[PDB]
Design a protein around this nucleic acid. Sequence first.
DNA 1: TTTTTTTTTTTTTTTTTTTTTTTTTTTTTTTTTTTTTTTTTTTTTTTTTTTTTTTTTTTTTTTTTTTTTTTTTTTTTTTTTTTTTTTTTTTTTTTTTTTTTTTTTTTTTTTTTTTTTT
Length: 49
Amino acid sequence: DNYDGTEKIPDVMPTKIPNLLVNGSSGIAVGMATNIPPHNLTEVINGCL
DNA sequence: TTTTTTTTTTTTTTTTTTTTTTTTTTTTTTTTTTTTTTTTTTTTTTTTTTTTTTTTTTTTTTTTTTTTTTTTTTTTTTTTTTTTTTTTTTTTTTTTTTTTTTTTTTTTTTTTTTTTTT
């Protein structure tokens, strides 16, 4: 449920694409900090297979 | 195949101008110091009956020096003109209202790289 409690939000998307490796990410947390480069979708799917 | 003319951007560094850091003078601003106002009470001042011996005004008459007085000639007063100040129509500029068009900034958090100082 959302902040008001009047509507629902997904906890996680049911992805088919490996979005983390594919599109990458970059963010600055208080203690941690992530920096993940993008990747090619065909190569990542071959690795998954 | 060798040799000859011309064209411009650079070795440029110096003159002129512009931009950017500076600090004397009249207009603000916080402080201390002197003018205003309200209570207590307090000896002290001040309002009001009675008696009293006083000292200045009103019977009457006197004069003299200020009140009569006329007249010459000044000189303040009034007239016109022009300048200086005051005051009010006129104009200009700016601000606010509510729907529109556009934009612009300050910080956390981590991790890695430049970019100065020691």
